[PDB]
């Protein structure tokens, strides 16, 4: 099993940045994919940012030129980068990491807690 750490939420100005981390712990073996989801009252929830092993990443139209996610493989951490952030980027920011020991396993998928981020004057 593995244990996602996330740090670096809270309150933040209109046109503010913010650094989220998500540290992973445990038996971890092949990372095939970290991301970052967020959950927002009446926004359901979306994929924010992802990695593919191989480097390959995705973001969300809304966030695409302002966020910027990045990790250390050495360190199995996932951060996200936020920049120019706006009050429709308030929400719970969850990362997700799927590992598995073998091509021939499903992969399993372990969640971070969630951080609120709120963006208001």
């Known amino acids: 099993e593995v244990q996602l750490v996330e740090s670096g939420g809270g309150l933040v100005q209109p046109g503010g940045s913010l650094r989220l981390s998500c540290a992973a712990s445990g038996s971890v073996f ?4 970290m991301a970052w989801y967020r959950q927002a009252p009446g926004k359901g929830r979306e994929l924010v940012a992802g990695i593919i092993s191989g ?3 995705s973001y ?13 493989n050495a ?21 997700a ?4 020991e073998s091509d021939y396993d499903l992969g399993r998928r372990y969640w971070g807690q969630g951080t609120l981020v709120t963006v208001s004057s």
């Open 55 to 57: 480097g390959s990443t």
């Open 30 to 33: 092949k990372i095939n994919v």
């Open 97 to 100: 990491f799927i590992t598995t």
């Open 60 to 72: 969300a139209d809304s966030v695409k030129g302002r966020f910027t996610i990045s990790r250390d």
């Open 75 to 95: 360190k199995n951490t996932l951060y996200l980068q936020m920049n120019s952030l706006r009050p429709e980027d308030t929400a719970v920011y969850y990362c």
